[PDB]
Amino acid sequence: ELGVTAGFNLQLKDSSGQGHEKLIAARNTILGLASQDKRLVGVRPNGQ
Amino acid sequence: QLPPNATLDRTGKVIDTMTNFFMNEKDTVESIFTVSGFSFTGVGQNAGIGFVKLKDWSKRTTPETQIGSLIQRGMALNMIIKDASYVMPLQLPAMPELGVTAGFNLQLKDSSGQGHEKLIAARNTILGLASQDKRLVGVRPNGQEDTPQYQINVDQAQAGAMGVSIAEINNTMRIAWGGSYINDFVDRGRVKKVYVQGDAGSRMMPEDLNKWYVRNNKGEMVPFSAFATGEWTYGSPRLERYNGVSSVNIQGTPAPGVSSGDAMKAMEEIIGKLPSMGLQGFDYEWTGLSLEERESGAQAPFLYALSLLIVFLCLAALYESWSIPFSVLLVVPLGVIGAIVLTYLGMIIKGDPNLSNNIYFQVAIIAVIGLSAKNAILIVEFAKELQEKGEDLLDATLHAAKMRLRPIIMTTLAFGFGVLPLALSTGAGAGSQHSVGFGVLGGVLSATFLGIFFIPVFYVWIRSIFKY
Amino acid sequence: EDTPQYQINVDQAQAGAMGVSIAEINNTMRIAWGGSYINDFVDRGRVK
Amino acid sequence: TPEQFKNIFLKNTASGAEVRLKDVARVELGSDNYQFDSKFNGKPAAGLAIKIATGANALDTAEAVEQRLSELRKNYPTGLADKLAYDTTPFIRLSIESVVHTLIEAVILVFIVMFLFLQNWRATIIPTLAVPVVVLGTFAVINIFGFSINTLTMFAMVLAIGLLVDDAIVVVENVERVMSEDHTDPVTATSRSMQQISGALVGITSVLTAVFVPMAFFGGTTGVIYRQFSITLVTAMVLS
Amino acid sequence: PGASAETVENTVTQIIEQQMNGLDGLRYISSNSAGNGQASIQLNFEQGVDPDIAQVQVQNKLQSATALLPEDVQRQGVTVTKSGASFLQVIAFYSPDNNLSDSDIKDYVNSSIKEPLSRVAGVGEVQVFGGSYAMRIWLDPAKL
Amino acid sequence: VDPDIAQVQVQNKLQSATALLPEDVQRQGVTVTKSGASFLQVIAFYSPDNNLSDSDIKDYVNSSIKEPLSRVAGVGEVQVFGGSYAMRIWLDPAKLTSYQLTPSDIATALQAQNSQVAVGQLGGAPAVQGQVLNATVNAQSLLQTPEQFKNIFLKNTASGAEVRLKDVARVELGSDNYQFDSKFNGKPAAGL
Amino acid sequence: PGASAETVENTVTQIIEQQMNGLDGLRYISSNSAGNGQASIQLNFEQG
């Protein structure tokens, strides 16, 4: 049902149009906190 | 609706006045949302609409705060608001899916193909007469009136002589006066549009057409006035056809205390007067919810005939007789008489036009037929078995009546008390419940006081003609 | 079955020598010989 | 920005000046639509009018819209509010509740009248016990065929409440008489009663089922209205 | 574009109507022709006709109809839609305290609310009152 | 296979190739049909006194008979074997060479000098304060008769003279197609 | 062909997405614009 096996398909949306740089920065903060705190293994962003 | 050539400012002013009136009706109205320049007929500057939320039903319990009282009160905005064609407070149909407003929906057709002028002539006669019928209220056209228009006539020979390309003049005038979307631009991550049009001061009046120039092939600039004149005309802004024939649409409402069927009858009487007045060859059709009403009313006779037939045939199959089915179906009038009598009396002594011959009345009538057949069968199947066991016809029938009187009456009272809550209901769709309940409960009463007497007598007559 | 046909052969060279573009030649033949639909006019309320 | 549009180059004069777009036009950020003016209680407002896709449950759709809207509210600018100005679902929910109250009242009244004729609590309980069975079974059956809980099917149920207790009343009444007439045990008495009344039960059921059958075979909008009453009532009588 | 109502009826409305005569479960047709240049034809169907089959059939006839139309009309495009007349709801967006402007509210409704709401389940069509931002270039014919 | 579904799918694919087609092809129109039901009858409309040509009859069947018959109780489809009139410009080569004109020049003048003009409205939506009237401005520009096409202007002569279309071509109402000739019982006819 | 990913998004993806309303049974839409010039829009529907 998907290109490759995986779980917890999350989508981060740029509501109110901040920009691409802002969206990447927000994502990066998220990804940093995800690895560091708890109950998370191999949290990575998908595309290029 | 506002008169022809009326602007957005004037439409909005009518709406400001109209808004306050509803806003000041404080015991009845909660909020109003209004849009100027939009209507169900179409989009134009002289049309407008209002959405009016009344207060909760819990609070509007006095006579003054009923929906119909407010509708009547608002029906005077026609008299006070003087710049409008009409301001019409309307109600939703019972089934908002099947229509947009309550009332009748009529298409006046030009069968004989006489022309737009003649068709309008007929429509105006119709509206004039309908104004005088006491059974109708709020009868109006549902389409745009004929309006003054500005006609430009471009002199092709002059333009060709002057070096002006009619396609070029099209492009310039089109963009300047009408506006044109060129291409997109981005604002906060969304693509929006860019438009080019003349400034407002240049496009208001026909005299502003004399400010615009067209470039000729030599490249010089020749004013629009050189090859165009302009004139005021009169014409139809919106032509309509119904079923491949030119037509107009008329809608209205029944006056208080009048049924939907009576409104349709009054309208058809009015339309019949047309030939006597000299206007010949116009037809009509009922469209929309009126079309549904007529079709539903048309087929009740066939429903009744079929239900009676199936009862006859199943009863013949179950008791291997022909006389027993005839005896049973002979007492159906007595059940049906209560249903109709009680319905009519309720309508008259409640003044309610909803208590009428409608779909709910139809299902009530079938139910009453069923109850009458049930009671009959109870007496007669036992009478027949007593006769087979060996017993005089009269002895069997009188004995069966005596023995079954108690179960018949308690089942009939059970049924009648089941539907009494419908007749005594209030609020939130009580009209339908009233139709069903009044019909069924009346039937129950006549069946209990008239039917039981007639079951044994019809049985004994039929069985004396066809013995054994 | 195949039938005789007529082929036009235009010396590009002579045309260049004679100051005529190949495009002009093509369009002249196209309109003159093939016909062309230009636009519509409304005759008696119908478009032709 | 508008400033960029103001600077679009257009042409050059013989003298040498460079004609820009600002030199001939006024540039400003406005609407893409100038044909409507909407207000709410006399104050300027913006409106969204929603129409349902054909075949959708209005209540479901309204719930989903309110859900999505409540989600969206979290990113409103300071100073933005919304409010349903025009809404039909209150009336629908109210009228469903109306029909359900009248159905409960119907049941209570039927129980009272059956008590008036069957003077005991024991006799009275038997036809009452039939009501839950027939009502719930009828809902199960008609849902198998795609019929919903609307005003029409509830009207049919209320109309049926007074018919479904019939066969039961006939049975219980014959038992009570037989038990009174010859004083015998409830079991023996009952066996005797059924043998007496089976034909009457079948006849009652046949007529009441047959009257509502042809109704289910009409077309049009009227046929759709008819089918609700028809199918519900037929199932009720067979189940009874 | 640019045609009188009579021209529209004669050249567009009538030919499309003639093509639609002969759909499966058609009940009645209602059309209007307006002097801005627009034509509208509404086809009603019998009860029990499947909406999706009706839509595909209407497109199937429209395909051949659209070659018989004036070439400018052809350039404009023809649309096919299925929708009902009655509105289920109307939502009002406003600033109670008058600290967000009307242009802003209108734009906000058009950019962030309209599309997600028109994609909720069961919603068939959304009608919006009040436009979005646009870059407006108003020309001065004297300077042109 | 459901024939309606097959037809919609085919024309849906056809949208994807329309842009690659030639403009001349595009303008004529690409139509999609399915097979469906067959002929019940064929009516022949003819001139028994040889008074009407096949083209006028065709044109007459299409503009007058077609739509009344489509509305009949059980009719599915009505089709005519033929079309309607066209405006016909027949060019002379020697005359064009006299005035140094080309077929493309005539074509350009035809497309330039025959058009519909769209305008707009009086008191259009973003109107000025105090605007009192709103009306629609319509401009009738398209040509209607052969005389108007004859009088189209092309150029001026060296000696200040006027050269029109009628000076290089023969303007005419004629048929949209000339490829077929049909007769019924030996005389001009058009089939339905 | 020849376009950057940003150009594809502004001139194609949003234009095509702004008509994807009014579709019966739609769950969600995923789109991407790549720097080789391709736009992909995937529309997902409820069961049935």
Ligand SMILES: CN(C)[C@@H]1C(=O)C(C(N)=O)=C(O)[C@@]2(O)C(=O)C3=C(O)c4c(O)c(NC(=O)CN5CCCC5)cc(F)c4C[C@H]3C[C@@H]12
């Ligand atoms: C008439 N009747 C007795 C025949 C009959 O008896 C039997 C039968 N019973 O089977 C037949 O088969 C027929 O029906 C049939 O097959 C025919 C057509 O198709 C057809 C056609 O298609 C085009 N094609 C075009 O393009 C013409 N357009 C006009 C505008 C531009 C071009 C041109 C054309 F002459 C025809 C002739 C009919 C003949 C018809």
